[PDB]
Design a binder for these strands. Structure first.
Ligand SMILES: [Ca+2]
Ligand SMILES: [Ca+2]
Ligand SMILES: [K+]
Ligand SMILES: [K+]
Lengths: 301, 316
DNA sequence: TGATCCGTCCACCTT
DNA sequence: TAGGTGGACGGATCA
C-alpha cells in the first residue's frame, strides 16, 4: 500500500452493513492471507472462517492470488533490507487453500502479477461488483468500490470509492500516484519528512510534483510561511529532486500494471457439504457433525 | 533539565493559588530570563530592553502577592555540561555530513537593588544554588521551571509561576518519592537514560522505557549487569521473561553499549556535589526606592514617572 | 532558554 | 504480510 494513505482517505469512508452486501460479486485480494495466518494448519482455519463470513452474508467471492513480483517492487524491498523449503511449503498451503475454495464452489484466479491490480481490473470489466482488500495500492491501480476491514469483528465495513475521494479531497488517480512518491509505497521510498499532512499540503499548494520540484530547485527569497518552512525541512533532510522526480517508471507501474483482460464471467457453485466434511476431517480432525453445524446453513435446497 | 522529566513528575503536581504564597521567601531562578525575553519579545527582531520590561513585570507580580524573592543568577558552566552539550552537537552534525551581554545582567541587577530585592550569583548553576538555599532554610521555596533542581536536591518547587493563570504548580520531592517511588538517586539515574545537561542518555529510552528500567532493575548497575551478562553468556537469555527479551532486543538494535561509565560517577557527583555557596547568612529584604525606580524606568524605557507610580505605589 | 506541541519515524503486534 | 499503534524523536513555537 501507500504509506499512511488510509489516514488521508479515512474521512471519506462510508460504513455499510454486512447485510447490504447480499448477492454482491466481490474480488477478494487473498494475496496476503497465508502470511497472516502463519495448532496445525492455521492457513486452513483462517481461510475457512473468512470464507464462512463472506458466504454467511451471501457474498459471491472471487479469490485472487498473487502472480509475480514486479521489478520496481523487488528493488524497493531490497533497498529496505539495506524436507521442504519455504517456497515448497508456500506452494502446498496455497494448493490446500485453493482445494478448500473449490469444495466451497468458490472460483479463484492467479493474477499475472499483483493481485490488487487484477482486482481493480476485474471490477473495470464488471466481473465483480466490489473489491475486498485493505491494500491502498488498489486505488492507484484504478480501483474503486473498496470494502476495507471486512474481517474485523464489527457489524459494518468501510466503503471507499474514487468519486468520494475526488469530491472530498480533490484527489484523482494521478494525484494519488504522485502522493505515493512523497509518502512511499512498494514502488518508491518517498521523501524523508513527508508524512500524510505535509504530502497533502504539497499537492494542494503546487498541484503536481513537477511544480513542486521546480519551486524547490529554482529557489536554491520572498517565500510565504508555508514555502519557507518546507524548504528548510527539505534542506535539513538533504532532499534531492532530480530528473527522475517525478518518476515515469512509478507512473507506468501503477497506470499500466500487468493484468489479465479475460472477460469470461466467473461461475459460482454451491458448497459441497460431503467434500467439505471430509476435507475438514482430514486437515483439522473435525467430526462431520462439527462441520455441519457451520456449513448446513450455507446449503440451499 | 532532564528530558521528559516533567511528563513523569506532572501527575504529582498540586495547583496552588498565588494568594497563598504571601510572605514566602522564594529563591527565584532567573538564569535564563534575559535570553528568554530576547527571544520571546520581537517587532517585525528583538525589541529594545525587553529584559528590563520582562524583569520589571515579573518582579511586580511577585511583590503583588507579597512574595519575598531572592534572585539567583548563573556563574560558570560546569565542565561536564560543556562536554555533554558539545558532544551532543558534534553527533548531530555528524549525521548530516540576540546575545546576553554583561551590561544586560548589570542592568537587571541594578533594577533588583532599586526594588530592594536581594540577589546572588551562583558559583556555577543557579538551580543548584537554589536547592542549597532551601536546604539551609534561607528560603521557603524555589521558583523555577527547570527539572534539574530536583536532581540537585531541591524539594519545594513552584513551576509555571509566570504563566497567565490564577494558580502555580507546586511539586515536592516527598510526593515524588511517595507517589512515584523515585528518590534522588533514582532521578539522577533516570537522567542517564533520558538525557540532561550532564549526560546524553540512551537512544530509545523515553519516559516510559526509562521508568520501566528503574522499576524492574532497581538501579543502572543491576541493569548493566543484566544486559552485559546476558550478551556474553547467551545461556542466561533462555530463561528471561517477555519484558527482558523484548528490552534486550531493543537495546541490541539500538547498538547500546553499557561500559564502566555506566552509570557515571561523574554525573552522580555533579548532581550530588555541585559547586554552591554554603553561606548561612540570612537574606535581607529592602524597601523599593520609588525615586530611583522612577528614574531607572525613565532612562531605560522612556516611562514617565506617573506611569511608574501607577504600578509601583500600590506595591509599596 | 527549557518545556510543550505536533507531525513523523520506527518496530512490534495482529492478523 | 502490513496496517495500526505505542513510544520515541525532532523542529517550531510558547512563554
Ligand atoms: Ca500492494
Ligand atoms: Ca540546568
Ligand atoms: K515519508
Ligand atoms: K533518549
Amino acid at each position: 500500500g501507500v504509506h499512511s494513505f488510509w489516514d488521508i482517505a479515512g474521512p471519506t469512508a462510508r460504513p455499510v452493513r454486512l447485510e447490504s452486501l447480499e448477492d454482491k460479486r466481490m474480488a477478494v485480494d487473498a494475496s496476503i492471507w497465508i502470511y497472516q495466518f502463519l495448532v496445525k494448519n492455521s492457513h486452513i482455519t483462517g481461510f475457512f472462517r473468512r470464507i464462512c463470513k463472506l458466504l454467511y452474508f451471501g457474498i459471491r467471492p472471487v479469490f485472487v492470488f498473487d502472480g509475480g513480483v514486479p521489478v520496481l517492487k523487488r528493488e524497493t524491498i531490497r533497498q529496505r533490507k539495506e524436507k521442504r523449503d519455504s517456497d515448497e511449503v508456500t506452494m502446498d498451503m496455497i494448493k490446500e487453500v485453493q482445494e478448500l475454495l473449490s469444495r466451497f464452489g468458490i472460483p479463484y484466479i492467479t493474477a499475472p502479477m499483483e493481485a490488487e491490480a487484477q482486482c481493480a481490473e476485474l471490477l473495470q470489466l464488471n466481473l465483480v461488483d466490489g473489491i475486498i482488500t485493505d491494500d491502498s495500492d488498489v486505488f492507484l491501480f484504478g480501483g474503486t468500490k473498496i470494502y476495507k476491514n471486512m474481517f474485523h469483528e464489527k457489524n459494518y465495513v468501510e466503503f471507499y470509492d474514487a468519486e468520494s475521494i475526488l469530491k472530498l479531497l480533490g484527489l484523482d488517480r494521478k494525484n494519488m500516484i504522485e502522493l505515493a512518491q512523497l509518502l512511499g509505497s512498494d514502488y518508491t521510498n518517498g521523501l524523508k519528512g513527508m508524512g500524510p499532512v505535509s504530502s497533502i499540503e504539497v499537492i494542494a499548494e503546487f498541484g503536481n510534483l513537477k511544480n513542486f520540484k521546480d519551486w524547490y530547485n529554482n529557489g536554491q527569497e520572498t517565500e510565504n510561511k508555508f514555502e519557507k518552512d518546507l524548504r528548510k525541512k527539505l534542506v535539513n533532510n538533504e532532499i534531492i529532486l532530480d530528473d527522475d522526480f517525478p518518476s515515469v517508471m512509478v507512473y507506468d507501474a501503477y497506470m499500466r500494471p500487468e493484468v489479465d483482460h479475460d472477460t469470461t464471467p466467473f461461475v459460482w457453485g454451491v458448497p459441497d457439504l460431503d467434500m467439505l466434511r471430509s476435507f475438514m476431517k482430514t486437515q483439522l480432525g473435525w467430526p462431520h457433525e462439527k462441520s455441519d453445524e457451520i456449513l448446513i446453513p450455507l446449503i440451499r435446497d
